[PDB]
Symmetry: C2
Subunit: 247 residues, 2 copies
């Protein structure tokens, strides 16, 4: 059976003091990291503070990684640098980077290639817009986005997919757990047909829409939903209840 | 006279071990930080390590900052976060970000605005390409780039300009100290035109082309060159000799 994976994407949020308070609350939750992956993704300049404050049962990662290696790339963090710091996970392709920073499918591919070369684990995000869903192109779009990078995956425990239902983010539309499940099953089929059945059955596919204490249980119970990449709710001490839903 | 300013742009380079050795070597240099500013710009995830290892005479900063404040901007570091950590300096508009990440003049303006609002000191980069220089567009280009942000400066000690001779970076062309001086003179005139004489005479304008232990004195001794944003040479223990040129 697939190991569930609950991730806190703190995005661009936090102070040293707020992180102290929050990590303390997180540490109070008793869970078994051999059975459940729980990963916190602080801002880069908060990583050291966050890693020192969280018990090892919490895995940690960063919210982006360079498509380039070491060298003359001012402002970038290479996979090689991340590995030297023992940063375990990277987020790649988050919708906010595709939107504000014009990150492309090819950028996602190059970031994944660099990450896997340097023995990092990657949380790779994709998903269709409102316009794309309205045009009945959900499968077309997700197939293209996944096929941009999927051949790079060698170990299907080390790459974790995230479906962001962008059609239901800031649009006034909401995704039901069943609607999420349908897309997750479609994603797993795409992996099966491009990689193989064993590979598809191994890979974690997380929901990256709006997750909170009220809907987490309904989402995690869906057959093809293996966890979540959680936004605003992961900034609250009640995030521990979201973790509990996957325990 | 203007206070000289010597900055190490480590770009995307370093390991925990190489930084330990390099900062230790830097610490052996006895300089007075009231007489010159010496600023180290490590990779974001190296900031805490670097700040801890460097003695208090060294100033520190980060290589980029967000145009957005706190919120849903995965992978970004806000000026508010930098303020909370007492990160003193930020680099804005580096050529590598304009090139690889399509950072625009408007982005530079907005990043400066966010930085100044949060009491961060900004090292703001600009400069013309080989094609632009060959078309005699140096002044036109630099005037436009400087005018994108210069009206925001409310304290001429807190913003530091950097001229990057992109025509002499990876092109096979070399900038002479004399050529660098003329551009710096041109830049200070633009600041005079837009902001006033006192303001122009106060602002540091650094050379951001290739600087090493051999050429550093020839550059800093020019009337309108107030220091440097140093690349490759700042990864070496001999960087102390570049600092010495400003002492």
């Amino acid at each position: 059976a697939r190991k569930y994976f609950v991730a806190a994407n703190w995005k661009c949020n936090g102070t040293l003091e707020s992180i102290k308070s929050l990590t303390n609350s997180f540490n109070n939750l008793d869970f078994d990291p051999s059975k459940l992956d729980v990963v916190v993704f602080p801002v880069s300049v908060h990583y050291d503070h966050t890693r020192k404050l969280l018990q090892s049962k919490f895995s940690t990662g960063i919210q982006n990684v360079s498509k380039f290696g070491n060298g003359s790339y001012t402002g970038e963090v290479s996979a090689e640098i991340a590995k030297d710091l023992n940063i375990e996970y990277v987020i790649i392709g988050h919708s906010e980077r595709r939107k504000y920073f014009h990150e492309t499918d090819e950028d996602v591919r190059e970031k994944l290639q660099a990450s896997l070369k340097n023995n990092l684990k990657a949380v790779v995000c994709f998903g269709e817009s409102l316009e794309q869903r309205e045009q009945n192109k959900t499968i077309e779009v997700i197939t293209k986005q996944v096929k941009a990078f999927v051949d790079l995956i060698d170990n299907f425990d080390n790459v974790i997919l995230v479906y962001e239902p962008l059609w239901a983010i800031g649009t006034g539309k909401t995704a039901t757990p069943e609607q999420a499940q349908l897309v997750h099953k479609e994603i797993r089929k795409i992996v099966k047909d491009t990689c193989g059945e064993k590979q598809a059955n191994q890979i974690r596919i997380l929901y990256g829409g709006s997750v909170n204490t009220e809907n987490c249980s309904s989402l995690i119970q869906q057959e093809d939903i293996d966890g979540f990449l959680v936004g605003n709710a992961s900034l609250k001490e009640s995030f521990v209840d979201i973790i509990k839903s996957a325990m």
